[PDB]
Amino acid sequence: QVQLVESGGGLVKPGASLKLSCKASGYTFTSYGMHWVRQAPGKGLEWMGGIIPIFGTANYNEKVKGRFTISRDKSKSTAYLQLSSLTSEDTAVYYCARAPGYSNAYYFDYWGQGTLVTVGSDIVMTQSPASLSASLGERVTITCRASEGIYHWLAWYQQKPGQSPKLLIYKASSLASGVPSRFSGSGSGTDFTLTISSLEPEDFATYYCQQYSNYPLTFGGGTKLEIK
């Protein structure tokens, strides 16, 4: 029973500081990495940084490095994200997400529920189409393009409305455990695709791709797959 619980969000004024907390339970905290990814409309998913709890080492997205600080408390099984000099641009849902390895250049196997924060040389991942209407029992293929070669270091996530993302595929074509057989991914280099061989009602969602070849970790803008 993997559980990630974020807390500490709220409504703040420009220039404020805010500390977020992520409580991990149901697994050994020090065996996995801990990242912070934020999401807002029109801004998509944006990697903040991650930390390897046994080493206490962290990597950041250059756009927030020095302003935001990640830390951990191994005895508490908790990762933290310290926000500073907050601006209108930092308005987002802040997720903590687990990385299944000892590298900060990775994909995430579990995401928390998110905590809302409101203030009042990069590999570009592009997804197309932005939206696609489809009907049940149909085969659908969606695309993801990397601005430069990423070998097979690509992950696909599904996000249903009101929910956090869920891992579908990692390593471009490896299906995540418990994911239905109707999902497949293919590609290498810069050209990637996700296919659902026969749509089920649960498959109507937004799909994101993410590269984990270089820093910063970057996400595509998403494809919303909707009924008829």
Residue type (1 letter), 103:
S
CA distance 72 to 14: 26
Spatial CA neighbour of 220 closest among 142, 166, 139: 142
- Domain limits of the chain? 1-120, 121-221
Tokens found for residue 194: 């996700």
- The C-alpha atoms of residue 139 and residue 137 are separated, in whole angstroms, by 7
Nearest 10 degrees: Cα torsion 49, 55, 56, 61? -20
Q: What is the DSSP letter of 68?
A: B
- Give Cα separations from 165 to 11, 37, 64, 90 (angstroms): 24, 11, 22, 20
Fold of 121-221: Immunoglobulin-like (2.60.40)
Give the side-chain half-sphere CA count within 13 A for 32. 23
CB 167 within 8 A of CB 109: yes
**What is the structure's resolution, reported in angstroms to one decimal?**
2.2
Determined by X-ray
| Paired tokens of 61 | 């997205």
| DSSP tag of 148 | S
CA dist., res. 110 & res. 133, Å (int) = 28
CA gyration radius, the chain: 17
Read out DSSP for 71-99? Answer: EEETTTTEEEEEE-S--GGG-EEEEEEEE
